[PDB]
Structure 1
Amino acid sequence: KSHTICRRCGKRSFHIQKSTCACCGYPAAKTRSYNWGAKAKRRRTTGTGRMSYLKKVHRSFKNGFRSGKPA
């Protein structure tokens, strides 16, 4: 084989010789994306995962990110 899993995206695109993922650009900090890959971008953008924290932020904006205990 020529590829293995990736520590960042888990997709089998991590080249062995160069130790560089062909999907997400690992181990570089900036994730690999290209404006001509419109369909590819839609396959991994925001919203394709849990969005666990971002959903919490949207829920908390309505009341102004308030804290404390209700009376």
Structure 2
Amino acid sequence: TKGTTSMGQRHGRTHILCRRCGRNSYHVQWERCAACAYPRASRRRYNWSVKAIKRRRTGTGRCRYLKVVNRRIANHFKTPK
């Protein structure tokens, strides 16, 4: 019967970890990610969910290089003699 008994019939898994975005959203059979559309070159982005866009945009991570290049621009690419 549907309900409690059928919950014990669920084996395996549909999704695993994604190499590109790290979420548990990589469809094993279709070999594509439901969150970032990997391995497509571009990523998922939809205007009907601005809240989801703000969770993934630039500045939500580390910005290892952007911080450095922002400093060089502000100092007009200073160099010694």
TM-score by length of 1: 0.88
Match of 1:11 in 2: 23
Deviations 1:24-57 (A, max 9, x none): 1100000111111200011110001101101111
**Structure label with greater radius of gyration:** 2
Match of 2:71 in 1: 59
Q: Which whole-Å CA distance do the structure 2 matches of 1:54 and 1:19 have between them?
A: 32
More helix by share: 2
Which structure 2 segments of 5+ residues have no match?
A: 1-12
Q: How many residues align?
A: 69
Q: Report whether the alignment pairs 1:50 with 2:55.
A: no
Which structure 1 segments of 5+ residues have no match?
A: none
Structure with bigger RCO (C-alpha 8 Å, 6+ apart): 1
TM-score by length of 2: 0.78
Structure 1 segments (4+ residues) deviating >3 Å: none
Q: Which whole-Å CA distance do the structure 2 matches of 1:15 and 1:65 have between them?
A: 46
